[PDB]
Amino acid sequence: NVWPRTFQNADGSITTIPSQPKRILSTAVTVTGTLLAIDAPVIASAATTQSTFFEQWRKLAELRQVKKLWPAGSVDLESVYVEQPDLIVVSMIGADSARDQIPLLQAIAPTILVDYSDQTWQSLAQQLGLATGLEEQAERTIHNFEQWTKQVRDVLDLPKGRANIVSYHGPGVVNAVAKAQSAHAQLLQSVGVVLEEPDPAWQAGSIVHRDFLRIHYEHLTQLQAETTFLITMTDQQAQAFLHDPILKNLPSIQRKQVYGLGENSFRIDLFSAREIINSLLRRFAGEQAQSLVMPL
Numbered sequence: 286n287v288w289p290r291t292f293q294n295a296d297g298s299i300t301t302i303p304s305q306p307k308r309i310l311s312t313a314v315t316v317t318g319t320l321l322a323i324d325a326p327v328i329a330s331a332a333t334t335q336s337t338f339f340e341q342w343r344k345l346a347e348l349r350q351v352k353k354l355w356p357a358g359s360v361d362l363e364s365v366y367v368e369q370p371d372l373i374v375v376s377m378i379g380a381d382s383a384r385d386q387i388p389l390l391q392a393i394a395p396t397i398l399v400d401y402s403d404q405t406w407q408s409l410a411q412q413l414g415l416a417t418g419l420e421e422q423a424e425r426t427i428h429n430f431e432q433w434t435k436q437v438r439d440v441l442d443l444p445k446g447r448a449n450i451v452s453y454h455g456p457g458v459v460n461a462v463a464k465a466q467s468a469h470a471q472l473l474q475s476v477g478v479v480l481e482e483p484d485p486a487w488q489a490g491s492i493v494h495r496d497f498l499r500i501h502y503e504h505l506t507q508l509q510a511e512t513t514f515l516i517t518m519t520d521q522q523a524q525a526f527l528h529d530p531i532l533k534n535l536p537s538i539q540r541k542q543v544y545g546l547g548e549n550s551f552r553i554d555l556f557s558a559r560e561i562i563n564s565l566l567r568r569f570a571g572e573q574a575q576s577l578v579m580p581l
């Protein structure tokens with residue numbers, strides 16, 4: 286395990302990490318879940334704009350004494366200095382991105398930049414494993430999860446056809462649909478779901494996103510999949526989608542195959558991925574469900 290080592294950042298820049306990181310500070314709440322997943326020594330993390338940690342890993346973060354820092358958008362440099370980190374992690378795109386603050390952060394400690402929007406949680410874990418010297422941990426974690434998804438894939442009786450994954454906000458608002466490279470789409474694909482891709486031409490406005498295509502509301506009526514999964518929703522919450530009169534003729538609504546992906550499914554990390562797969566076992570597997578549900 287060689288140190289120093291060079292890390293390739295998502296913007297084409299490089300960062301030399303002089304020594305194995307032991308005090309990692311995350312500036313992106315999305316990335317923190319994956320740092321926890323590989324048991325990296327993350328000692329502090331910024332939060333959502335609402336000053337929260339994601340619920341799938343909050344209790345674990347508290348147990349490991351991960352200090353909650355600023356809500357996304359407002360980097361507190363004093364807090365970074367006081368934590369005395371030896372690696373600072375930044376995301377490329379998303380509400381939790383501190384990309385423009387990199388020069389200020391790099392003055393404090395080696396700062397790296399990753400894009401979680403177009404890779405699986407496993408790929409992000411591998412990338413972070415290489416930055417932290419935790420390749421053994423990451424590889425083991427990924428391998429174990431993949432052994433599990435194999436087993437699950439073999440017992441699910443999924444609806445015929447394909448599924449889409451939607452972030453729903455109702456009429457008169459820009460909504461969003463998961464793209465093939467998203468952590469969400471790839472997670473479902475891994476247990477045998479066949480994914481519908483939103484038409485790239487439906488992009489709303491000028492901002493490019495690799496995770497979910499942002500679209501005018503009306504385009505939701507054009508989705509063809511027989512099944513719809515809603516992020517950040519329970520099944521009960523998904524009822525609002527099902528009863529939206531504008532969407533009454535959607536194949537997934539006609540077949541009453543609209544499901545919540547789960548309360549904690551907004552971002553995908555090992556912890557929310559487990560919850561999501563557990564939900565699929567409960568709904569689509571028989572008395573084979575329980576033999577495979579993972580303890581949280």
Ligand SMILES: C[C@H]1OC(c2cccc(O)c2O)=N[C@@H]1C(=O)NCCCN(CCCNC(=O)c1cccc(O)c1O)C(=O)[C@H]1N=C(c2cccc(O)c2O)O[C@@H]1C
Pocket residue numbers: 314315333334335357378379380381452453454460461494496497551
């Ligand atoms: C539990 C909460 O933590 C965050 C969160 C945490 C960390 C990073 C994020 O991005 C986060 O959203 N999300 C929840 C929250 O604040 N809910 C209140 C509504 C926020 N909303 C409006 C609703 C439409 N968005 C989607 O349907 C959607 C779908 C799929 C993926 C997404 O990221 C989506 O937001 C947003 O658009 C928010 N994201 C941008 C943003 C800005 C610049 C570049 C981007 O890529 C952006 O997303 O700006 C807002 C703050």
Ligand SMILES: [Fe+3]
Pocket residue numbers: 379380
């Ligand atoms: Fe967002």
